[PDB]
mmCIF file of N, CA and C in Angstrom:
data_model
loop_
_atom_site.group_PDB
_atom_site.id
_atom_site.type_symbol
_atom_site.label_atom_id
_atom_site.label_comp_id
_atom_site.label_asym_id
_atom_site.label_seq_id
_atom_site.Cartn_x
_atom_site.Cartn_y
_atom_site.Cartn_z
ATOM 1 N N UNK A 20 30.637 -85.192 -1.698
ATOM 2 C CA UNK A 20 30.332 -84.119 -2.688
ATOM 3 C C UNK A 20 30.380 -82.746 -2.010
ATOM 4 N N UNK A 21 30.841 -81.807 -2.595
ATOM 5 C CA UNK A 21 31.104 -80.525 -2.179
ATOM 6 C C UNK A 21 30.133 -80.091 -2.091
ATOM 7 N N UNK A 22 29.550 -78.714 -1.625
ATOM 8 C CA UNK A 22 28.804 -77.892 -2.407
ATOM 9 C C UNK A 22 29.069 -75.928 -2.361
ATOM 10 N N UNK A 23 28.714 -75.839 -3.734
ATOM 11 C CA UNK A 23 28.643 -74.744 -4.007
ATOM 12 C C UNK A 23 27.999 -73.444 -3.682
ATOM 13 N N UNK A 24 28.030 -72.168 -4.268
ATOM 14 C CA UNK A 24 27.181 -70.863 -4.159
ATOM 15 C C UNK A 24 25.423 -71.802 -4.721
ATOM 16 N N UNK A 25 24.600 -71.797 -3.909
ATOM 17 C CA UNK A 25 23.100 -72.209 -4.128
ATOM 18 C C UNK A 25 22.847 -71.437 -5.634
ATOM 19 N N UNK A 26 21.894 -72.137 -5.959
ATOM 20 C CA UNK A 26 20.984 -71.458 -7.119
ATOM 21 C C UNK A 26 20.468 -70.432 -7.054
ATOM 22 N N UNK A 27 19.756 -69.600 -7.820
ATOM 23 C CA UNK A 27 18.971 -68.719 -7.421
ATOM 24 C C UNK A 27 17.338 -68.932 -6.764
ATOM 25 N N UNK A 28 16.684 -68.373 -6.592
ATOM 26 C CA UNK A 28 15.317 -68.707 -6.561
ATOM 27 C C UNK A 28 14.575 -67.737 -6.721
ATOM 28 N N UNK A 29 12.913 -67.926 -6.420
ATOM 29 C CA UNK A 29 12.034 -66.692 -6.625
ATOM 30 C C UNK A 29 12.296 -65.496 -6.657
ATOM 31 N N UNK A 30 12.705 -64.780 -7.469
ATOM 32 C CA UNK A 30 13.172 -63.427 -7.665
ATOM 33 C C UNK A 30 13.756 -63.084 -6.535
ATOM 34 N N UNK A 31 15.014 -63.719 -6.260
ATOM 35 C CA UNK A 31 15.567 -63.792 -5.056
ATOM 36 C C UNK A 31 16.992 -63.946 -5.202
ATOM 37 N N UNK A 32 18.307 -63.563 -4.533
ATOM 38 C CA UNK A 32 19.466 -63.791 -4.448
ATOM 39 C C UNK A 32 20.210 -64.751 -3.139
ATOM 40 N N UNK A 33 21.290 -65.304 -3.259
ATOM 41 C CA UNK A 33 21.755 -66.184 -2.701
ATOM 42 C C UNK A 33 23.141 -65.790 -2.234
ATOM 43 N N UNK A 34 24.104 -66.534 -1.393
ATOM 44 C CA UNK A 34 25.408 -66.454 -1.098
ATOM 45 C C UNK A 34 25.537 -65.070 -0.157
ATOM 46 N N UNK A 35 26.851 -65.030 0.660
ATOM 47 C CA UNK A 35 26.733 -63.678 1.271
ATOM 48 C C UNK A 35 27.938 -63.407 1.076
ATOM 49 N N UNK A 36 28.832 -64.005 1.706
ATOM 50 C CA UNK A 36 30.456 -63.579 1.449
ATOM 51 C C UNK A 36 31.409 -64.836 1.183
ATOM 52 N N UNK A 37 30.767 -65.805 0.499
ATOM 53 C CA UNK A 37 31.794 -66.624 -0.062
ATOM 54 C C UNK A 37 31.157 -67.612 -1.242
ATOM 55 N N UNK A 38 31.966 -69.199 -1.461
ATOM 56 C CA UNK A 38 31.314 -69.685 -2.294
ATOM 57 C C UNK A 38 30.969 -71.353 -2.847
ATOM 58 N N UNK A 39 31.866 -71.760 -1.441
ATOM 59 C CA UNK A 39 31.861 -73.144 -1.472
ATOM 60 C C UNK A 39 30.925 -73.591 -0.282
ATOM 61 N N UNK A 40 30.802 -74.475 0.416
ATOM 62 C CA UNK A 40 29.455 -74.804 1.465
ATOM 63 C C UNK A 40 30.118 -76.501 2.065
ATOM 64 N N UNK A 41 30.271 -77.360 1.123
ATOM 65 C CA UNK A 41 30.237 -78.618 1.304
ATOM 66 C C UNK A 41 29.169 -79.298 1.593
ATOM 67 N N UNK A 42 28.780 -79.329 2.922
ATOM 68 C CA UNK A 42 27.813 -79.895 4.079
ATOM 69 C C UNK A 42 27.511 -79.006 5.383
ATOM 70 N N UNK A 43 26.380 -79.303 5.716
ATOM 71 C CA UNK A 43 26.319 -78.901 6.636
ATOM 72 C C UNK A 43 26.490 -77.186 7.358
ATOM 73 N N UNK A 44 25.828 -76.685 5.597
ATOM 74 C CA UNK A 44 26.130 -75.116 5.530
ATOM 75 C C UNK A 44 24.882 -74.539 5.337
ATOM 76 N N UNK A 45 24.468 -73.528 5.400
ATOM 77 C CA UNK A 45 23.228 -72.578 5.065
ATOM 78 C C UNK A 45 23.415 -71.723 4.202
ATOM 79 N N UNK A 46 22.731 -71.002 3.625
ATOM 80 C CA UNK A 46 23.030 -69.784 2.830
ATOM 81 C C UNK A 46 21.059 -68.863 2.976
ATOM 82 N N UNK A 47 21.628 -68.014 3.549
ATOM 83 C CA UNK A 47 20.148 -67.049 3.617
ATOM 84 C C UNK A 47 20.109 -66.399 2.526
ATOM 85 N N UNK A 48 18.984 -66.784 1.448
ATOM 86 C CA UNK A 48 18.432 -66.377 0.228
ATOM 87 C C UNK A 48 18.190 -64.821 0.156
ATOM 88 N N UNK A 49 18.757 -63.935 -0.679
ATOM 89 C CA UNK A 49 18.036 -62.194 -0.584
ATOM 90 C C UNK A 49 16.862 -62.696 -1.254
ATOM 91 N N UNK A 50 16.000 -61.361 -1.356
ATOM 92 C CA UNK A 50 14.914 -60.935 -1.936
ATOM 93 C C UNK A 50 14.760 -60.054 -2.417
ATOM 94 N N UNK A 51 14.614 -59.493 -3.813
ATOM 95 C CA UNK A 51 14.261 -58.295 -4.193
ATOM 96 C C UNK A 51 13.846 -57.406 -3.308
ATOM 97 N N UNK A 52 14.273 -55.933 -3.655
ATOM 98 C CA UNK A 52 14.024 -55.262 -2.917
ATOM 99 C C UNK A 52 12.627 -54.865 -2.362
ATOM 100 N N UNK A 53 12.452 -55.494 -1.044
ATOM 101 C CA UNK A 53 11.113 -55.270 -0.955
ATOM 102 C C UNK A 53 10.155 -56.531 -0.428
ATOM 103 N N UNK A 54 10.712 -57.789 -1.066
ATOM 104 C CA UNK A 54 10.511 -58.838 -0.706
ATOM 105 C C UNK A 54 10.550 -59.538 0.094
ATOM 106 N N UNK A 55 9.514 -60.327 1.153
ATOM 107 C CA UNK A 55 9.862 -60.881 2.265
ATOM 108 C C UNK A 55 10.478 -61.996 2.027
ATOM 109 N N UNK A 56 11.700 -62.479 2.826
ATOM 110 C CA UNK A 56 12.155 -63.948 2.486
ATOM 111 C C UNK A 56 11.580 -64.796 3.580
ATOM 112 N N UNK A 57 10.798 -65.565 2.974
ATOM 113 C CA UNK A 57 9.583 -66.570 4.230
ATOM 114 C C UNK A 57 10.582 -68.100 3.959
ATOM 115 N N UNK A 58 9.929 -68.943 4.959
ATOM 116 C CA UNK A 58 10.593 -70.141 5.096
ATOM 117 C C UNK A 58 11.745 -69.756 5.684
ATOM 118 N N UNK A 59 13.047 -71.476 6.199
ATOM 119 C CA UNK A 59 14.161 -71.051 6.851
ATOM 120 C C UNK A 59 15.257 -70.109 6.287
ATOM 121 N N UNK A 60 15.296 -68.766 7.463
ATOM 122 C CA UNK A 60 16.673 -67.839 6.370
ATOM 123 C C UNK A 60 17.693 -68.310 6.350
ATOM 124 N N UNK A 61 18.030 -69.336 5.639
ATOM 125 C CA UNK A 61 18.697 -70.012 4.873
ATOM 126 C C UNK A 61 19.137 -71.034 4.288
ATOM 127 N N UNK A 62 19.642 -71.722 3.262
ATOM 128 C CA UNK A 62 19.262 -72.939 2.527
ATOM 129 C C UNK A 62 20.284 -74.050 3.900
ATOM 130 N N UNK A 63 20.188 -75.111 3.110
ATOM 131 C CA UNK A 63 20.802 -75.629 4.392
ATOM 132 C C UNK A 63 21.710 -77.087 3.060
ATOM 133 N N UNK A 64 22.752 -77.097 2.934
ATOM 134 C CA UNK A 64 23.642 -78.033 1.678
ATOM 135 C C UNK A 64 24.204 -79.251 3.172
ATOM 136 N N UNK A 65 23.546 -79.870 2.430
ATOM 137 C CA UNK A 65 24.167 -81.043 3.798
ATOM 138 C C UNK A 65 24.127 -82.406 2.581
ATOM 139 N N UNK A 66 25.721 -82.962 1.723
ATOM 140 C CA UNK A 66 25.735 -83.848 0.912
ATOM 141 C C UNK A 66 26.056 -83.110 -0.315
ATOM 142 N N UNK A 67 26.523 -82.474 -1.041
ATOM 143 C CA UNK A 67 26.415 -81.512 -1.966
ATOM 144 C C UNK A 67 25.049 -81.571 -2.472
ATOM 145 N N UNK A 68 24.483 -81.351 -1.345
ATOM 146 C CA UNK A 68 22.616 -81.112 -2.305
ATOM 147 C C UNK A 68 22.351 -80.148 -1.370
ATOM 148 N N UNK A 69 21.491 -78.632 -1.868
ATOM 149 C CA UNK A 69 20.788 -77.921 -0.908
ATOM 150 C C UNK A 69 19.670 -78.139 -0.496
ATOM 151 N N UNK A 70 19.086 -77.889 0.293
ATOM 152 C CA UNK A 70 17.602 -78.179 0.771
ATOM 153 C C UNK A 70 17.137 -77.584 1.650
ATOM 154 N N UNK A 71 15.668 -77.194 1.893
ATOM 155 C CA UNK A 71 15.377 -76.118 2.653
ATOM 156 C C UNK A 71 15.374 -74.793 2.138
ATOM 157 N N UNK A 72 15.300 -74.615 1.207
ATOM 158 C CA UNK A 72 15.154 -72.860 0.454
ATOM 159 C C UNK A 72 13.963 -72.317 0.977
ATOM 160 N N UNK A 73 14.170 -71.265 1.439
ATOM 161 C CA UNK A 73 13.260 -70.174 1.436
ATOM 162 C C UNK A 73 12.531 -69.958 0.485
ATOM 163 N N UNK A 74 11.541 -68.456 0.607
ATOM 164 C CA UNK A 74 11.371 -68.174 -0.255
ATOM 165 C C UNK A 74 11.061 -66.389 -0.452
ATOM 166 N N UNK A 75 11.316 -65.682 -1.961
ATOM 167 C CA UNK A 75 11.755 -64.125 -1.666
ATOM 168 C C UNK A 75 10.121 -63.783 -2.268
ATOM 169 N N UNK A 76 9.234 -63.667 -1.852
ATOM 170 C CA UNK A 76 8.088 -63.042 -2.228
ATOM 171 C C UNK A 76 7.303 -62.202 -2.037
ATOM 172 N N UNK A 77 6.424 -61.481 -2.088
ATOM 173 C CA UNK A 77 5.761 -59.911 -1.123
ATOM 174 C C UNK A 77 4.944 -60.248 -0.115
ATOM 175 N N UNK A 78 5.016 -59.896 0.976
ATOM 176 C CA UNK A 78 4.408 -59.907 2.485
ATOM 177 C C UNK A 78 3.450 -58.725 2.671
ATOM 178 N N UNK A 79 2.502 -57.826 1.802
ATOM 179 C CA UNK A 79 2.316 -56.855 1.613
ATOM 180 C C UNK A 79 0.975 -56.639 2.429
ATOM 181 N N UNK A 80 0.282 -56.972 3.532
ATOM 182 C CA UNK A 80 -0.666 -57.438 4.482
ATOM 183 C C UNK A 80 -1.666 -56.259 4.098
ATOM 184 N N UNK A 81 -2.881 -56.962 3.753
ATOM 185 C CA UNK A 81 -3.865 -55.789 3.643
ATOM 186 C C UNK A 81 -4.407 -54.829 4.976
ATOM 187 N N UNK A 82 -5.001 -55.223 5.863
ATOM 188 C CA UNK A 82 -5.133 -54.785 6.965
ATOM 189 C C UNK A 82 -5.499 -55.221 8.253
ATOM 190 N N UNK A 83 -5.142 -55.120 9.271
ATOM 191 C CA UNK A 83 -5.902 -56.396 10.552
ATOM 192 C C UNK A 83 -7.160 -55.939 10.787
ATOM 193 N N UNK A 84 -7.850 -55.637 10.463
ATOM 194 C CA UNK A 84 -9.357 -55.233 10.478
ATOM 195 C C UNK A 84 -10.113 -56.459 11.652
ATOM 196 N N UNK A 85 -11.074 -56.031 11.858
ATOM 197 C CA UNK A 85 -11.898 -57.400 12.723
ATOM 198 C C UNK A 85 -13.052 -56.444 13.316
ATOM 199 N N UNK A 86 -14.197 -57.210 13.753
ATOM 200 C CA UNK A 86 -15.956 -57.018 14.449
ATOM 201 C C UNK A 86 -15.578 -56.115 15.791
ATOM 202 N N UNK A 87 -15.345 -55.235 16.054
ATOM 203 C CA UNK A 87 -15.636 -54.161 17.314
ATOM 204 C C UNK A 87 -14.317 -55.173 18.013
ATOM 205 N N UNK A 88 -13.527 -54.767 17.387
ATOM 206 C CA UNK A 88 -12.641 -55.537 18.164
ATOM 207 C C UNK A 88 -11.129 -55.534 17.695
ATOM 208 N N UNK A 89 -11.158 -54.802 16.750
ATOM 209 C CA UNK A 89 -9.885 -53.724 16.148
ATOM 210 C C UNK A 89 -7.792 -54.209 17.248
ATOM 211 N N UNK A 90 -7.275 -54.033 16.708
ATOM 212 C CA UNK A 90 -5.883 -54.748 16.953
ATOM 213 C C UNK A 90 -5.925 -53.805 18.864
ATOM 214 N N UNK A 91 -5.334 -52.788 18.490
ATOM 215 C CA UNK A 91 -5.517 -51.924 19.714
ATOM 216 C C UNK A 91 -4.122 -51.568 20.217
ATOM 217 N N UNK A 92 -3.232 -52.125 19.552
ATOM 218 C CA UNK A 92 -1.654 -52.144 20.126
ATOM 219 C C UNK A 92 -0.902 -51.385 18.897
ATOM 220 N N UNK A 93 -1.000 -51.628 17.812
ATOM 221 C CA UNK A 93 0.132 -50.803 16.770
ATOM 222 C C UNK A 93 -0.237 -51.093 15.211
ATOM 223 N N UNK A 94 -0.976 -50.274 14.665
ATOM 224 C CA UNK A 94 -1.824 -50.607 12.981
ATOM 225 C C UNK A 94 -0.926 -49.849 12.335
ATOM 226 N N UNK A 95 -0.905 -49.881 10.817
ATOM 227 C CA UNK A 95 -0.484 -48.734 10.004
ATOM 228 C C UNK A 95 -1.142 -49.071 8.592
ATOM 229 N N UNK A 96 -0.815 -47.782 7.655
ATOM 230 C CA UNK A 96 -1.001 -48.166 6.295
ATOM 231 C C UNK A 96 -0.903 -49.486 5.796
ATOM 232 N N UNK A 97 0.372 -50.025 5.841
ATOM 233 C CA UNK A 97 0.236 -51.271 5.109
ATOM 234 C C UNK A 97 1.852 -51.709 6.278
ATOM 235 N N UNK A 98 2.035 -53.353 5.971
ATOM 236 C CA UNK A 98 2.218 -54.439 6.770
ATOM 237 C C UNK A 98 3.314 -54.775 5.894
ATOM 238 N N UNK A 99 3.861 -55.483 6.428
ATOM 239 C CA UNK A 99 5.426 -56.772 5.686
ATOM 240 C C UNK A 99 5.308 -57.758 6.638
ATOM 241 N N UNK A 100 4.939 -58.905 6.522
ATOM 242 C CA UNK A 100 5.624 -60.137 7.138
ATOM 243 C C UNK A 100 5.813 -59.362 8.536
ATOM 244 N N UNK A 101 5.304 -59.159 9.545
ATOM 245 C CA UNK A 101 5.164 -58.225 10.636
ATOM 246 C C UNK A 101 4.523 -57.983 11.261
ATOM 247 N N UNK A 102 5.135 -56.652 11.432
ATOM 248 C CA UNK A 102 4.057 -55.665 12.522
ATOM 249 C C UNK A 102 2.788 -56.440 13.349
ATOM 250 N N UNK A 103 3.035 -57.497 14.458
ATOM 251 C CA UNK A 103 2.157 -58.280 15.167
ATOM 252 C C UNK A 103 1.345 -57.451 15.435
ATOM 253 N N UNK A 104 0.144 -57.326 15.090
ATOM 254 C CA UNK A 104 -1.081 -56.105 16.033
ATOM 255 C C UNK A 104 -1.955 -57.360 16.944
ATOM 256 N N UNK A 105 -1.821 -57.129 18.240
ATOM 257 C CA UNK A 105 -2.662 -57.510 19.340
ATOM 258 C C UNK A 105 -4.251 -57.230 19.096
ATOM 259 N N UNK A 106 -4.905 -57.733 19.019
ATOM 260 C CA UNK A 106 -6.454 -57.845 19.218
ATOM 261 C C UNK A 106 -7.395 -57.465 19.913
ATOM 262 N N UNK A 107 -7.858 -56.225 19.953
ATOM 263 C CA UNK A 107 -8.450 -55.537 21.738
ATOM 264 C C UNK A 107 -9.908 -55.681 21.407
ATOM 265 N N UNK A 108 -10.840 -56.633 21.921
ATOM 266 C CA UNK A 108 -12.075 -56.867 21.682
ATOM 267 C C UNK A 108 -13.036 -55.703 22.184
ATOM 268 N N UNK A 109 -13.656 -55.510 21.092
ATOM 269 C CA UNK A 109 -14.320 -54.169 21.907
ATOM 270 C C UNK A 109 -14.801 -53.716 23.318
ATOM 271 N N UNK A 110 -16.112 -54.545 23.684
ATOM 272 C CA UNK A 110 -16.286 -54.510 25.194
ATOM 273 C C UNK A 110 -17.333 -55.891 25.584
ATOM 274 N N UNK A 111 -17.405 -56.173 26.137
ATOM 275 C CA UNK A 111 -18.183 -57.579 26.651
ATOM 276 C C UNK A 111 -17.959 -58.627 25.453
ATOM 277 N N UNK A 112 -17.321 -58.517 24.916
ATOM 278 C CA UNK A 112 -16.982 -59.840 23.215
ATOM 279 C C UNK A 112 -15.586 -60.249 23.490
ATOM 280 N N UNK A 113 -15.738 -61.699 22.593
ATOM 281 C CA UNK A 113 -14.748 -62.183 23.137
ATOM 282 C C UNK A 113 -14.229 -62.721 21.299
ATOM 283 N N UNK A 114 -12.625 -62.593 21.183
ATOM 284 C CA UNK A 114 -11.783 -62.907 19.934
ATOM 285 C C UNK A 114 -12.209 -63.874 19.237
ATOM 286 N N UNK A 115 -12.937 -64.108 18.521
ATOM 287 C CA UNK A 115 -13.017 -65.602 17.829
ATOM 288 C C UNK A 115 -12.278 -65.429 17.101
ATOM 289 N N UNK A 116 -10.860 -66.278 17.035
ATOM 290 C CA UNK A 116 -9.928 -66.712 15.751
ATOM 291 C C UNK A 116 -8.747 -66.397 16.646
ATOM 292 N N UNK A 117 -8.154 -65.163 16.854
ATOM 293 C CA UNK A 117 -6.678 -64.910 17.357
ATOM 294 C C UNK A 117 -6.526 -63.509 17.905
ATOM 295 N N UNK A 118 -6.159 -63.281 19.129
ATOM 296 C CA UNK A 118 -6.096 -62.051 19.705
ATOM 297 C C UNK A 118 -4.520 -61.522 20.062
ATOM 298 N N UNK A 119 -3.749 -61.958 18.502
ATOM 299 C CA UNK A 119 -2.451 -61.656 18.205
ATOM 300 C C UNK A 119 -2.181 -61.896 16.904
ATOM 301 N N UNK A 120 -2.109 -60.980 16.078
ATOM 302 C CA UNK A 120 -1.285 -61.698 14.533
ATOM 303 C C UNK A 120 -0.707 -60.535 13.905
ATOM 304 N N UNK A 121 0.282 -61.308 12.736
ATOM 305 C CA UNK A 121 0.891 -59.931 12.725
ATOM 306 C C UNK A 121 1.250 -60.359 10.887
ATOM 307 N N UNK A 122 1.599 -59.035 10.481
ATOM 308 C CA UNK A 122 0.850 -59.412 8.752
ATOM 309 C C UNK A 122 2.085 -60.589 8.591
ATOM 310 N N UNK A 123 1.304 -61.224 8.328
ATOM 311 C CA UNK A 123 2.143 -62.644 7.615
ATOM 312 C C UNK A 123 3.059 -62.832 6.248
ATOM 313 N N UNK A 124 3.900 -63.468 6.060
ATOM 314 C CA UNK A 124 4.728 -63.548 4.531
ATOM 315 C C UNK A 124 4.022 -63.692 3.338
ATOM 316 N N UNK A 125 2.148 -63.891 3.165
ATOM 317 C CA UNK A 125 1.519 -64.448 2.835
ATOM 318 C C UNK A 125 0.390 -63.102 2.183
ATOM 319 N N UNK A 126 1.108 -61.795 2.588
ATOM 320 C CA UNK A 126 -0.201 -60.581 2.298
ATOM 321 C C UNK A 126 -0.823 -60.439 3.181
ATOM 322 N N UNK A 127 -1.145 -60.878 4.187
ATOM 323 C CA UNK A 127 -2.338 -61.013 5.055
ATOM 324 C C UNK A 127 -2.139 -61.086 6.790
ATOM 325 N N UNK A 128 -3.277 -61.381 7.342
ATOM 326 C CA UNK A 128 -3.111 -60.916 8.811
ATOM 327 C C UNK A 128 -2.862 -62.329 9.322
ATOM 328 N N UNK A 129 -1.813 -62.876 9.634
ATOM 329 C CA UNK A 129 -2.022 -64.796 10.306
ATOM 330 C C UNK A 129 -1.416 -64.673 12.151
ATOM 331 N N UNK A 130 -2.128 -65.186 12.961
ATOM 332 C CA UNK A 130 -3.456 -65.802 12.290
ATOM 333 C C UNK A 130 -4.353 -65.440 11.440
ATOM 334 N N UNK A 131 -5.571 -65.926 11.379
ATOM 335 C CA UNK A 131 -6.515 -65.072 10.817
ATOM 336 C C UNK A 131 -7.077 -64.394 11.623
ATOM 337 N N UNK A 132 -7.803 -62.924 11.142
ATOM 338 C CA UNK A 132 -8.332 -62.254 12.316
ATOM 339 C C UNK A 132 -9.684 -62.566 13.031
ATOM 340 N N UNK A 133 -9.424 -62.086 14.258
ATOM 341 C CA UNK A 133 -10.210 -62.475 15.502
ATOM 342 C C UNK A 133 -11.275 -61.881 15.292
ATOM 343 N N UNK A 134 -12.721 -62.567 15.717
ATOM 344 C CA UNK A 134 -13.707 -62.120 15.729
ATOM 345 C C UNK A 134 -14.731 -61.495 16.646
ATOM 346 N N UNK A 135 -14.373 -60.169 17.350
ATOM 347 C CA UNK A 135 -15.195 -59.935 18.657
ATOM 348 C C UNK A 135 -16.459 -60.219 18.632
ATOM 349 N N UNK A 136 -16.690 -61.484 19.195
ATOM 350 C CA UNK A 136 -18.228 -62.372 19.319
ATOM 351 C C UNK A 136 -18.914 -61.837 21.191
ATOM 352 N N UNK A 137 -19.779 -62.367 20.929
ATOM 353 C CA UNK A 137 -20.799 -62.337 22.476
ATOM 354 C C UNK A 137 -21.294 -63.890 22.901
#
């Protein structure tokens, strides 16, 4: 079985510069503008069936915030699926959770953020 240009998905676009696949092909899903595409960038048609789709959804990370113990390497307004901020524990405390994350495809800070404990 052949395969074709993929389906569409989550408010998301497909194909890049052609339109057949067969097997053993990928196709990296767009995303609205704006949209992070999470999961593998790109489908993967192995049998004329695709499998493995991504997905095009907002990565829009609220903030890496955390207990006296703030990122310390690179913050901003707002995040995409990104911007890793490092974890600088304030002073004698130590990270509980992760002393690296960076806003995730998910809105948010993943890991989750670290907790400068004693």
């Amino acid at each position: 079985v052949k395969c074709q240009s993929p389906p569409s998905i989550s408010n998301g676009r497909h194909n890049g510069y052609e339109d057949f696949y067969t097997d053993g092909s990928v196709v990296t899903y767009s995303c609205n503008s704006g949209y992070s595409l999470i999961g593998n960038s790109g489908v993967l048609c192995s049998g004329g069936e695709w499998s493995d789709p991504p997905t095009c959804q907002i990565v829009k990370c609220p903030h890496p915030t955390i207990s006296n113990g703030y990122l310390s390497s690179g913050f901003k307004r707002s995040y995409s699926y990104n911007d890793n901020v490092d974890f600088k524990c304030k002073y004698g405390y130590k990270l509980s959770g992760s002393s690296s994350s960076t806003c995730s495809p998910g809105n948010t800070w993943k890991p989750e953020l670290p907790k400068c404990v004693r």
